[PDB]
Subunit: 341 residues, 3 copies
């Protein structure tokens, strides 16, 4: 027992929600204990009911958000149940050495492994499966990726000596999927990930996804699963993309404070319209809602947002501010005396 | 008449030129009145005379640049003449609430609407049509996008307490187009936007444009329509892309001061070779010309620049500086006594 | 002889290595003399032995890294031997005027030219061939690109008044290739660049590379050609991409200090997981190795990294730090008393 710190077990929750944590803490460093269970399963990924052979951490795309503080140790039990068919591992971009932990965590079905890494770098970071060779992109684009957030012990700041505090936090994992089609253009179904592999690899090689989804499927964060907020709330939106670039935009809003490279040692940019998540990274945006109503959160390739699945909704309760925006005259017939050339 | 400020009507001009404005102002806030008229029309988009069914604000791709100051109110009359076939609206990324104004501006052919938004955020911002669902990307990649610039009341600064002033300003709108081809590879023509839609949507789904153009067509800003400048002039180049990333580069020059995320609350970067406009945003670069001659302004995917239409020219008058660059020896035969292995 | 400075001949070396230079210097400005010889040749670009008709500076993809100091003059002899079939030239993104030198350097086979440019802008910059029109992207994606580094005379700094010094420097040139296929999907071979052109241009038009390689071929910087370092060494990694965006990531490491836009007048970002090289630019990352072992350096589009060739290896000698990372429990059977739902 060389490392003599207090241990704290964390129960992970399904995205887009985030397990209970403190922003600022005066506790010393702890060993923060997490468990991730690999689950291979068929999942529905679009509104027409297209299925595909997914591979996940904890049964979700993305994997759950892990939250710790700078100087904590993160002790992860990775479990690969014997119902799975492939070996898996885990690479933390937040970690130092052994390919992020991938070189120490390769487990066959029926095995588990325990990795400990010190959280020396602040920010939001991708984690993902990386077995080796062509298996790396295949496991990642099959759904085996998530994120970890390492907060400064004093919480967030604006990089100019002022504390920032969020009222709410959501984790938006964006997934590029490569679903094979038959000669007529219909999506193909398979009985196992292994059976899907050869056809999937051919789609992956052309670098054009068939679907781009938040929280594992088209429409996942729309309708009844819209994200909730209130006028005046500072909301932190963590956005990850393990394989492909994304350009997040809150329609009707802004990024008040944006860490687009996702690392809290760097001051955020202010008042962004659209920001950029480089493939293989996580970023974070803080926004204080000023108006009630529906907001679409998109990647601002609008073809991807509207036609390949990459739209989420916020439903924001409160009172409308007519000073910021108003309809001066409702839609009306163009006046007869108008010239419009 | 709740809002009791002076009103000022602005006459918009066609890109790449920009309507008359002040950089720094000591006037108080005003209500700045703009009119945009939707025009659906067939347009020529390449040097071989390829046509396509465009949808525009004010008859141009991009729509005109609107320039206001922080704290102004922007009152926009959007007009959809009864010669048009579809409903349209407008979303300002500069605006707060109601999906940027899109939720308050949906008008059928024969209708107009008046929206007012407060310019609380400084920078250059995209505006675009966003009717709903798959219509959003279709109207945007059909040409319905432009930009607005919200200047600080004191004009631009270098983020270190020094004022920056431009001698000239150009607005470069970049458009990704998706033109259907027949089985032989020839571009297809249609008699209406509606007739083009199904085939166009199939091209859009593969996320590879057929054309990438500045100011609405290949070669628009070359030859006689080259952009003019003089040695010693500080030129502001505003660049927008509503749907797809761009990487602007001034061949033979630099970006002296670049806001690549386009927001003047953030200090510019200095001395860039190539900068990055994320899809769904506008950015701005200031350069002081040091040498006369021809400059190509490109997106530095050179396939897009040279083969899909995304090249503009600057013609710069003045005297050559042999200290910065000189031809020491003109092309000559390789000397007989040379070894070149 | 208007310019009366000392002259210094530099001997270039093949990437990923870099010719001998000083970081900080108290010498005054010099005329730094470089020679580049164009070589068209068939080259092997993947591990299955696929060939293609390359065009190179000095026989390598990328061209060699040139290193000078701010205020130096760079005098380049470009040679196009009569064994070559096409005209060539050179454009320096570091240079001011005449399209970066391209307008002053166009040479037929059997000719040479001497260009001098003043190094007024600090950073890493792309250089590339740019003959004119569609020849520009074709020569660049055929391999005619490299980089130049213009150091501040005081060497690198962290943008907050602290000197940064590297123990080692590597230049990673990333190349997107467009190799034609026959109807069965096999790569086509040609006897000359001219014969390859028409088929290659058709692949280039669809903006999807067939290969993405470091140092000219899949696996070039793996196995026996892994990059060497030691625990505790600060290593500068210069990364260029003349045509297409890249997202570099050091697997198991970080970017301690990253200039992603590549320009030393701007403070670096700290502690990045993944950074972004915009097509048509060079960037630089400093990392101090903390753990021994194998590191993969990738573009974090993992399809490109694992399946299209864009992976390099570092082999790092030293002692493992179990405080940063440890395997707490080796792979073992899942305990019988475990519940994993
Ligand atoms: O996309 C090609 C072609 O295939 C069809 C079916 O023949 O539709 C498929 O692809 C669509 C777009 O991805 C999906 O909407 C649908 O689930 C799938 O069957 C054609 O409609 C289409 O032109
Ligand atoms: O800098 C972050 C900041 O943006 C704020 C200003 O305090 O608001 C932006 O939009 C508001 C709209 O009323 C204005 O107060 C302000 O002028 C503008 O930059 C906050 O919401 C937040 O702290
Ligand atoms: O691009 C496919 C194929 O189509 C042809 C005509 O059969 O040319 C078309 O496409 C070209 C590239 O976009 C355009 O230059 C031209 O306007 C269009 O007819 C072939 O030339 C080409 O291989
Ligand atoms: O920082 C902006 C600045 O770049 C300037 C320097 O004042 O010039 C750059 O190129 C010039 C070439 O002669 C040099 O003065 C300077 O050393 C270099 O950084 C201006 O054009 C502008 O203010
Ligand atoms: O990629 C299409 C198709 O072509 C085949 C040969 O028929 O393989 C070629 O393409 C592969 C992927 O690029 C290469 O691995 C190989 O060198 C090349 O022959 C098929 O295997 C493949 O489905
Ligand atoms: O800011 C650059 C800096 O990162 C350093 C800190 O000095 O290390 C990072 O990782 C180390 C792991 O032990 C820690 O010292 C530090 O807390 C963390 O930010 C150096 O390697 C380098 O100077
Ligand atoms: O130690 N107090 O939180
Ligand atoms: O399955 N994803 O939330
Ligand atoms: O572990 N890979 O299939
Ligand atoms: O009020 N003077 O510009
Ligand atoms: O039609 N565009 O300038
Ligand atoms: O309003 N859309 O076609
Ligand atoms: O002049 N001394 O290096
Ligand atoms: O051929 N390239 O190193
Ligand atoms: O010089 N171009 O083939
Ligand atoms: Cu896996
Ligand atoms: Cu990774
Ligand atoms: Cu419209
Ligand atoms: Cu938008
Ligand atoms: Cu060439
Ligand atoms: Cu260039």
């Amino acid at each position: 027992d060389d490392l003599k710190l207090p241990r704290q077990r964390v129960d992970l929750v399904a995205p887009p929600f985030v397990h209970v944590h403190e922003q600022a803490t005066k506790q010393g460093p702890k060993i923060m204990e997490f468990k991730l269970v690999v689950q291979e399963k068929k999942m529905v990924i679009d509104e027409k009911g297209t299925t595909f052979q997914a591979m996940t951490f904890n049964g979700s795309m993305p994997g759950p958000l892990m939250v710790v503080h700078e100087g904590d140790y993160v002790e992860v039990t990775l479990v690969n149940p014997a119902t799975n068919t492939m070996p898996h591992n885990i690479d933390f971009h937040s970690a130092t050495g052994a390919l992020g932990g991938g070189a120490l965590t390769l487990i066959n079905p029926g095995e588990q492994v325990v990795l400990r890494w010190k959280a020396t770098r602040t920010g939001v970071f991708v984690y993902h499966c990386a077995p080796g060779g062509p298996m790396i992109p295949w496991h990642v684009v099959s759904g085996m990726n998530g994120a970890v957030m390492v907060l400064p012990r004093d919480g967030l700041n604006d990089g100019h000596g002022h504390s920032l505090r969020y009222d709410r936090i959501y984790y938006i994992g964006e997934q590029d999927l490569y679903v094979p089609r038959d000669e007529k253009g219909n999506f193909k179904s398979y009985d196992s990930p292994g059976e899907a592999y050869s056809d999937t690899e051919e789609v992956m090689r052309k670098l054009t996804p068939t679907h781009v989804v938040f929280n594992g499927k088209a429409g996942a964060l729309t309708g009844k699963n819209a994200l909730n907020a209130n006028v005046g709330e500072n909301v932190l939106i963590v956005h990850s993309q393990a394989n492909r670039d994304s350009r997040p935009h809150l329609i009707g809003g802004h990024g008040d404070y944006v860490w687009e490279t996702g690392k809290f040692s760097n001051a955020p940019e202010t008042g962004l319209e659209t920001w950029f998540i480089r493939g293989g990274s996580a970023g974070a945006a803080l926004y204080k809602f000023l108006q009630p109503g529906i907001y679409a959160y998109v990647t601002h390739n609008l073809i991807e947002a509207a036609n390949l699945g990459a739209t989420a909704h916020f439903k924001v309760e409160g009172k409308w501010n007519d000073d910021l925006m108003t309809q001066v005259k409702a839609p009306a017939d163009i006046p007869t005396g108008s010239t419009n050339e």
